[PDB]
């Protein structure tokens, strides 16, 4: 299967600001032979929604085609349908939710017709996780096993529930569609129960679009915004969540924000950390900060410099020549205090490796 001999570490970054928001994002191919991730990041939507913003991560499987179409067109399918539009002036919460649902069902069918018409060869699919942010609400959107969360008042205020085939209601739909869940996989193949694309799994006669083996139906949750308490939102694929929990990543991201306001750097730190914790998947993360996101702290910055210097001195000493793996192993056995919460030693590997490289460049 995939797996390069060595991971592709190259970061694809973007950042922006507007509407009171700041964001950064990072995607990385990592250990996989193919890159099948995509994202959307836009502040200011067209057609009177200039005060609105939209961010999404798409985790492609069996190809990048579906993820790529979604990242460029999901938003317009969501906003340009009668359900979203309603209405009077400005969409109601119900307009937004129905509009999002209709957009998912319609882009799915759209791609299906395009493929049939052009005899498409790919059999790809994609998760989608995102937030549509209005002046007064954050609407979380989830379809698949990517995941998003909102940090408010230093805590995980909300996170999306992953769609897995073994989930009771998913299992039920799958079984009613003539299929089975074997361990965690639909008919022993697919490890997600909801996705755009995967049309081979949406061919059951006598069942509607949302009653197929795999469903394109998103789950949407409206959270009223809190200007005072809202801190940040994290959107990421399972490449991140497979190795870091909600609380851990929230704590870790806070610790990094206390050291720098460069959001691309914080996203890169998350991605590298997850690679070093053993993630062998593509990884994508979007970090969206609100006005009251944690601020850089002089004391945090000092502590980070102190820790870096301390690690540098440990490496010098441990090098009496042990390889990097053995140095990491020794450092781990020393139970070093004050490592980043959640990130731990893995989140300091870049600092450790840089010193190691200076001392053992060959
Ligand atoms: Mn993945």
Numbering used by the authors: 2 to 321, 327 to 368
Provide passages from the article that reported this PDB entry.
The PP2Cα is the prototype PP2C family phosphatase for which the catalytic mechanisms and cellular functions have been well characterized. The active site of PP2C is located at a cleft between two central β sheets, and it harbors a binuclear metal ion site required for catalysis. In the crystal structure of PP2Cα, the M2 metal ion is directly coordinated to the primary chain carbonyl of the Gly61 and the side-chain carboxylate group of Asp60. In addition to these direct interactions, the M2 metal ion of PP2Cα also indirectly interacts with Glu37 and Asp38 through water-mediated hydrogen bonds.
We made a D38A mutation in PP2Cα, which eliminated the D38 side chain and abolished the indirect interaction between D38 and the M2 metal ion. To further elucidate the structural basis of the impaired function and catalysis of D38 mutants, we solved the crystal structures of PP2Cα-D38A and D38K with Mn2+ at 2.0 Å and 1.85 Å, respectively, and compared these structures with the PP2Cα-WT that was crystallized under similar conditions (1.95 Å). However, in contrast to the crystal structure of the PP2Cα-WT, the electron density for the M2 metal ion and the phosphate can't be clearly located in the D38A or D38K crystal structures. Specifically, one water (WAT11) between the D38 and D60 in the PP2Cα-WT crystal structure was replaced by two waters (WAT8 and WAT248) in the solvent channel between the A38 and D60 in the D38A crystal structure, which form specific H-bond with the main chain amide of G61. The positions of these two waters preclude M2 metal ion binding to the D38A mutant protein. Our crystal structures revealed that the D38A and D38K mutations altered the water-mediated hydrogen bond network and disrupted M2 metal ion binding with the maintenance of the protein folding and other active site conformations, which provide specific tools to investigate the functional role of the M2 metal ion among PP2C phosphatases. However, the overexpression of an equal amount of PP2Cα-D38A mutant as the wild type only slightly decreased the EGF-induced ERK phosphorylation, and the overexpression of the PP2Cα-D38K mutant has little effect on the ERK phosphorylation increase. Accordingly, the D38A decreased sulfate binding by 4-fold, and D38K decreased the sulfate binding by 10-fold. As a result, the βlg value of kcat decreased from −0.31 for PP2Cα-WT to −0.55 for D38A, and −0.44 for D38K. As a result, the βlg value for the kcat of H62N/D38A is −0.7, which is significantly lower than that of both H62N and D38A.
